[PDB]
Motif scaffolding. Sequence first.
Motif, PDB file in Angstrom:
ATOM      1  N   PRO A 262       0.796  -1.234   0.000  1.00 46.73           N
ATOM      2  CA  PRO A 262       0.000   0.000   0.000  1.00 46.73           C
ATOM      3  C   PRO A 262       0.823   1.276   0.000  1.00 46.73           C
ATOM      4  N   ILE A 263       0.244   2.280  -0.660  1.00 40.12           N
ATOM      5  CA  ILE A 263       0.794   3.630  -0.703  1.00 40.12           C
ATOM      6  C   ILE A 263       1.122   4.143   0.689  1.00 40.12           C
ATOM      7  N   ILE A 264       0.339   3.766   1.690  1.00 41.09           N
ATOM      8  CA  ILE A 264       0.590   4.211   3.056  1.00 41.09           C
ATOM      9  C   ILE A 264       1.855   3.501   3.529  1.00 41.09           C
ATOM     10  N   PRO A 265       2.949   4.199   3.840  1.00 40.03           N
ATOM     11  CA  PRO A 265       4.177   3.491   4.210  1.00 40.03           C
ATOM     12  C   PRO A 265       4.037   2.708   5.504  1.00 40.03           C
ATOM     13  N   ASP A 266       4.836   1.642   5.590  1.00 38.56           N
ATOM     14  CA  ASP A 266       4.798   0.749   6.744  1.00 38.56           C
ATOM     15  C   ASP A 266       5.060   1.489   8.049  1.00 38.56           C
ATOM     16  N   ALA A 267       5.928   2.497   8.023  1.00 39.78           N
ATOM     17  CA  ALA A 267       6.287   3.202   9.247  1.00 39.78           C
ATOM     18  C   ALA A 267       5.108   3.982   9.805  1.00 39.78           C
ATOM     19  N   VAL A 268       4.390   4.685   8.936  1.00 43.62           N
ATOM     20  CA  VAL A 268       3.283   5.516   9.382  1.00 43.62           C
ATOM     21  C   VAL A 268       2.174   4.649   9.948  1.00 43.62           C
ATOM     22  N   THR A 269       1.850   3.564   9.255  1.00 42.71           N
ATOM     23  CA  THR A 269       0.849   2.671   9.803  1.00 42.71           C
ATOM     24  C   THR A 269       1.324   2.048  11.102  1.00 42.71           C
ATOM     25  N   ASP A 270       2.614   1.750  11.246  1.00 44.83           N
ATOM     26  CA  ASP A 270       3.090   1.238  12.523  1.00 44.83           C
ATOM     27  C   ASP A 270       2.858   2.252  13.629  1.00 44.83           C
ATOM     28  N   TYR A 271       3.112   3.528  13.343  1.00 41.32           N
ATOM     29  CA  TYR A 271       2.844   4.570  14.325  1.00 41.32           C
ATOM     30  C   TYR A 271       1.371   4.627  14.696  1.00 41.32           C
ATOM     31  N   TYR A 272       0.483   4.547  13.709  1.00 38.84           N
ATOM     32  CA  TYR A 272      -0.940   4.633  14.005  1.00 38.84           C
ATOM     33  C   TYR A 272      -1.512   3.355  14.624  1.00 38.84           C
ATOM     34  N   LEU A 273      -0.953   2.184  14.312  1.00 41.93           N
ATOM     35  CA  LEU A 273      -1.242   0.982  15.087  1.00 41.93           C
ATOM     36  C   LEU A 273      -0.887   1.195  16.541  1.00 41.93           C
ATOM     37  N   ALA A 274       0.313   1.703  16.787  1.00 46.04           N
ATOM     38  CA  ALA A 274       0.801   1.864  18.142  1.00 46.04           C
ATOM     39  C   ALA A 274      -0.013   2.875  18.921  1.00 46.04           C
ATOM     40  N   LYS A 275      -0.392   3.974  18.276  1.00 52.95           N
ATOM     41  CA  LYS A 275      -1.214   4.984  18.927  1.00 52.95           C
ATOM     42  C   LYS A 275      -2.484   4.370  19.484  1.00 52.95           C
TER      43      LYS A 275
ATOM     44  N   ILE B 153      -3.074  -4.379   5.420  1.00 53.89           N
ATOM     45  CA  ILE B 153      -4.482  -4.550   5.096  1.00 53.89           C
ATOM     46  C   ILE B 153      -5.297  -3.359   5.586  1.00 53.89           C
ATOM     47  N   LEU B 154      -5.076  -2.941   6.835  1.00 55.09           N
ATOM     48  CA  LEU B 154      -5.748  -1.734   7.320  1.00 55.09           C
ATOM     49  C   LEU B 154      -5.343  -0.522   6.495  1.00 55.09           C
ATOM     50  N   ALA B 155      -4.067  -0.460   6.106  1.00 51.84           N
ATOM     51  CA  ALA B 155      -3.618   0.513   5.116  1.00 51.84           C
ATOM     52  C   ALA B 155      -4.504   0.495   3.881  1.00 51.84           C
ATOM     53  N   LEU B 156      -4.741  -0.700   3.344  1.00 53.52           N
ATOM     54  CA  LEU B 156      -5.480  -0.849   2.099  1.00 53.52           C
ATOM     55  C   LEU B 156      -6.917  -0.376   2.243  1.00 53.52           C
TER      56      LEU B 156
ATOM     57  N   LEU C 248       9.167   6.694  15.458  1.00 47.61           N
ATOM     58  CA  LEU C 248       8.779   7.900  14.735  1.00 47.61           C
ATOM     59  C   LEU C 248       7.808   8.728  15.560  1.00 47.61           C
ATOM     60  N   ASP C 249       7.629   9.979  15.136  1.00 42.92           N
ATOM     61  CA  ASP C 249       6.903  10.987  15.887  1.00 42.92           C
ATOM     62  C   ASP C 249       5.628  11.399  15.156  1.00 42.92           C
ATOM     63  N   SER C 250       4.964  12.422  15.690  1.00 43.26           N
ATOM     64  CA  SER C 250       3.634  12.804  15.234  1.00 43.26           C
ATOM     65  C   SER C 250       3.669  13.620  13.947  1.00 43.26           C
ATOM     66  N   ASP C 251       4.514  14.650  13.885  1.00 43.44           N
ATOM     67  CA  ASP C 251       4.468  15.572  12.755  1.00 43.44           C
ATOM     68  C   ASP C 251       4.930  14.902  11.470  1.00 43.44           C
ATOM     69  N   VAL C 252       5.974  14.075  11.551  1.00 43.36           N
ATOM     70  CA  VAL C 252       6.429  13.349  10.374  1.00 43.36           C
ATOM     71  C   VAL C 252       5.338  12.419   9.888  1.00 43.36           C
ATOM     72  N   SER C 253       4.635  11.780  10.817  1.00 43.78           N
ATOM     73  CA  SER C 253       3.546  10.890  10.447  1.00 43.78           C
ATOM     74  C   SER C 253       2.433  11.646   9.740  1.00 43.78           C
TER      75      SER C 253
ATOM     76  N   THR D 131      -6.651  14.692   6.171  1.00 39.95           N
ATOM     77  CA  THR D 131      -5.697  14.032   7.051  1.00 39.95           C
ATOM     78  C   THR D 131      -6.372  13.576   8.336  1.00 39.95           C
ATOM     79  N   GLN D 132      -7.043  14.503   9.012  1.00 41.99           N
ATOM     80  CA  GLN D 132      -7.681  14.192  10.281  1.00 41.99           C
ATOM     81  C   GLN D 132      -8.744  13.120  10.127  1.00 41.99           C
ATOM     82  N   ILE D 133      -9.498  13.174   9.036  1.00 41.25           N
ATOM     83  CA  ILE D 133     -10.557  12.202   8.815  1.00 41.25           C
ATOM     84  C   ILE D 133      -9.980  10.804   8.674  1.00 41.25           C
ATOM     85  N   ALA D 134      -8.950  10.653   7.847  1.00 44.45           N
ATOM     86  CA  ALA D 134      -8.378   9.329   7.671  1.00 44.45           C
ATOM     87  C   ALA D 134      -7.707   8.832   8.946  1.00 44.45           C
ATOM     88  N   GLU D 135      -7.168   9.745   9.755  1.00 46.91           N
ATOM     89  CA  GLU D 135      -6.651   9.352  11.061  1.00 46.91           C
ATOM     90  C   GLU D 135      -7.747   8.740  11.911  1.00 46.91           C
TER      91      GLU D 135
END
Lengths: 180, 209, 110, 109, 146, 123, 96, 154, 85
Positions: G16-29, G42-45, H34-39, H68-72
């Motif tokens: 997926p276009i959504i990079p693995d790192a960003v989704t890892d951050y949002y999983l963790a959040k 898959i959640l990326a997709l 990784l951090d918030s703003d880069v994400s 951005t906020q919506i997809a978050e």
Amino acid sequence: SGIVPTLQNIVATVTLGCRLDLKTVALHARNAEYNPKRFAAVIMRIREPKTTALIFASGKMVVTGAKSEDDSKLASRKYARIIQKIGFAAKFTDFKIQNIVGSCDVKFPIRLEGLAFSHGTFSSYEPELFPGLIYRMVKPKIVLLIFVSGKIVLTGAKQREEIYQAFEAIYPVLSEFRKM
Amino acid sequence: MEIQQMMFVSGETNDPPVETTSLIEDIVRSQVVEIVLHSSQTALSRGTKSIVPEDVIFLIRHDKAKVNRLRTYLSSLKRLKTNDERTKNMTKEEYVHWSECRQASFTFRKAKRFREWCGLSHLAESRPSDDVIDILGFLTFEMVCSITEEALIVKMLEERKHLFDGPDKDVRPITSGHVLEAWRRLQKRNVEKKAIRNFQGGKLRSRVQ
Amino acid sequence: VDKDMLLKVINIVTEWIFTTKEKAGILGKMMIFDLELSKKFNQVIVDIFESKHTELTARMETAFLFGTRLSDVSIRKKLMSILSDSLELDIDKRLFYIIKDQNWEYLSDY
Amino acid sequence: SQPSLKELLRNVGADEGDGETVIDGDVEELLLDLADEFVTSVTSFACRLAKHRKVDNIDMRDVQLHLERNWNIRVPGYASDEIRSVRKFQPTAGYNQKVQGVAISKSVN
Amino acid sequence: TRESGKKGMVNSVITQTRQALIPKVPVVTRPTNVPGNSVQWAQDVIHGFQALLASEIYELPEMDNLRTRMTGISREHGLIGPVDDSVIEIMLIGLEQHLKGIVEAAIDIVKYRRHTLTIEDMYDTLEQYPYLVEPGGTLLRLQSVM
Amino acid sequence: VRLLHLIFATQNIYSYQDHVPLQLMDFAYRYTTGTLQDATIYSDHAHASNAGNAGTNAQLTTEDIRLAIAARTNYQFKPVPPKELLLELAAERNKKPLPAVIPTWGIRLPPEKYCLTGKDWVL
Amino acid sequence: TLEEILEMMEDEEFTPIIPDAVTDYYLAKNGFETSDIKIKRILALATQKFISDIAQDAYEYSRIRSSSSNKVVLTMDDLRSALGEYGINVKRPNFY
Amino acid sequence: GMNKKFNEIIHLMQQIRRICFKISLIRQMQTDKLDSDVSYNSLKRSISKILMANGFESTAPFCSDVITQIAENYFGNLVKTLKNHIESKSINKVMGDAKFQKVSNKDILLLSLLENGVESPDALYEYYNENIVKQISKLEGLKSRLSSFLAELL
Amino acid sequence: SHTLWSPSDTVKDAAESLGIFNLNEEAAKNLAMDIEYRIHEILDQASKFMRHGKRRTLHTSDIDRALKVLNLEPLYGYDVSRPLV
């Protein structure tokens, strides 16, 4: 014993290869509907062969109404006179047939339901979309409208022989679903 | 709603009393007035008073488009094929009655009373055309066919010497409760992909079909 | 209207029985014509029960019960003989029949 | 007069065909309580909205509106009350004057 | 100054509560004529608060109970005139629609495609979808029955 | 808006970020739009709409606004502290005894099948 | 089907276009760790698909705006309409 | 990054064909922790790379923040669903004493997808093929416009 | 008038932006009253979230959460960067 399709209308397009001053030729012809703000072309006509003709300044013309390839061609020659005698390069040429519609009557009601839901590959009945039941042949490219009374309409043939061809192939099918 | 009762017969089933047909009449009237509200609002927001077909087909904006296009041009699939194949039959004019419903929709000619019975005080400065009248005929017919399908589905999901006065030709399938459950079912809210705002509070939205 | 137009309508209704709900409303309003021509009309309602059961009894059973009431001896003997053979010969099942089945239409004087 | 429980059991026997039999003491009580709260709130807002009509009388057709408005429950039945208004977004001159004024402030001046 | 130039708009809590707890009574004046042709009563409010309401019994209320409860609320809010026997039915209709929606949600939770449902699944789905139920009264009670 | 800073001054919060006034003003606009919209609906309701029965003339007294707001706070806007409800509800909880047991100097966990066992999630 | 869908996410053919790192951050959040890579992709997709859906809503609702039959801008009216047609709530901005 | 690569090919074809559309109009009218703003900003990049429809970041910025906020929120709603099912503390879930999971670890996932948005799995297969068909469809539409304009300019 | 937030133009701007003409004055006074109270309400809630982050300079996350807890719709599209004019 013979049941054969009759030709109901041939729409032909032929080009009098030359520019045409539509205002002028409408004037002379006099009983030709030529009108502003809409459709820029002159609508000619003739008592027999009773055909209507849309003449366009692009040298091209579309004659309608003929019940036979020969009559059309004939009506296609009549028109290149009324717009030739009026000093013009009305060169009759590239005569083409745009569509041929026929009709036929087998004289026995048909069990369309049975035809449609054993031939759903080609047959079609949506009540809101249209009245009646259809059939789309792949070879030759013809669309036949079949009604219960047994009257069928054959459309889209670009050539005469395809009407007979289409009916010669669907007749045995209709005999199979003849309601008695 | 004599046309609706004919349309209800066209779908599959027979014998609605006056109750279900008047109810369905109210249903269709409400759906259609809402459609024209939305389309007129959108056109005037574009800045035009005349009601048009481009808005309305996109107002449906769904697989609801292929069938509507065919209806204009004239002017899953295996199941709809298989049920029709089962229908194949004749006598007492079997196939004949099927056609009646197809060519007795409001768009056939009776466009005037169909225009007037529904709302017409809206857009007093303009007046729509008959093309949209035919369109609405298509939409109303499809809505009646769908509602009937769901009513039959829920009905099925629920599961001595004769005294000669019972005719053995009378059945009682369809009533208020069936249609009500079906119209709840059809208001499936959104595909639920339009209500994904899962954890929150408060709600409101209108809907069609 | 005159009786000849009604007799021609009754003759046209006689050819119809040999929609079904459309024939019911014509036969139903002809029961209101009982208030002569009714003797021709209730002649038809006798032979309808002689031909056919599987037919829709919606127009039949409400006109059968006004057929025994109309005070003409040759058809009330005919109509009540049809109903009295359709039941069993026991006096039990004819006693349950008159209260548990065969609902009595007429609220009226009869 | 007239010759004188199967409502919930019918509300749930018609939802599914693979059992899914709920339990009383835990689940059923919840649902009954929800229903009670629903009726109380709805009739309260209805009676207020009837008094709003400047006639001290009975409450009818206010329930249908309250349902169609606050909850997302439409009833395709008895009352027929809709908005009738597109709710136009321009009164007389002066508002669109402000619109074009801030528009020219955005574009150039 | 201090606004609300009226007889008052209290902003406290306990008096809001009490005044929102006791039954009221729609008693009327009669300066010249106060029409209605049906005198106001508060026997109705007592009768309304005394009903065997839902959640004691095991079934959704049949008309009569609901009608007895409503008259009480209408008189208690300051209306008059009897409910007219069509209100109850439309209300039952909306109710059963509501509950079918809720239980459809829970069924969509438990099984994807012989099961049996519990309380926890309903708490799960009322954590996911809380827009269904209005907060107050029951959710607090729901987090004291687990 | 400077008056929004003036209103901030009432609560001893002089540390804003300057996006808040835009945001809260946007909010109040949205809120009051919805409010005096459904109040206009109710003003129509007193004016006895359907598919053509009468006109639509606006007065918008205070009672209609009160109606349009009470519906909103029916499902919003954290209300007065519902103390009595909580007191009785908590007495219902505060009714059944403690376990009165001794796990003997450790931690007592729920039984496995209620514990989580936070392994790497896997299919 | 379904099992092909986790036959496919593993290899580079579908990332997926959504990079693995960003989704890892949002999983963790929102509180999820697991040493699989499929599920996160898959959640990326699914999120990619949902935003694509609002994209097409915006495209068509822009296409209606004039001339059915200085470049394109996805403004606040287009967004107000599509977000509204969802469950996303009302956007009533203002001035003054 | 085949999905990234194909969205990039869509991006390139969009750039070139819209450029050609515009000049053709011009010629017509001539006449790791990784951090918030880069994400956040990575998500904004990915978002504005989605938007083949309009133009890549060719809209007001408020809308970019909105999206951005919506997809978050949506991603968070996904995970809040799956973890809720996983804790469950209900007999329908919860490993049975005899290792009998009424619903194994996969139905959880399929189900959480189902609760939020997506209905079935193969709708993703569908949207994927839909994407790659959108590529060639818009490709060929504007390529036929290109050829017809190359004919028209003569 | 009654309080802050002069309803002669503010509430007037709101209603005349909707497309009405007849808003009695006292109604708009009472409306100013209500919206000001809602302001103080949300503001105290976001303060409660402020002094758990043990900071002072209230950020937008505070009021966003303070909306999310009031069963009230959120508000998107307000980034700290790219400041105001």
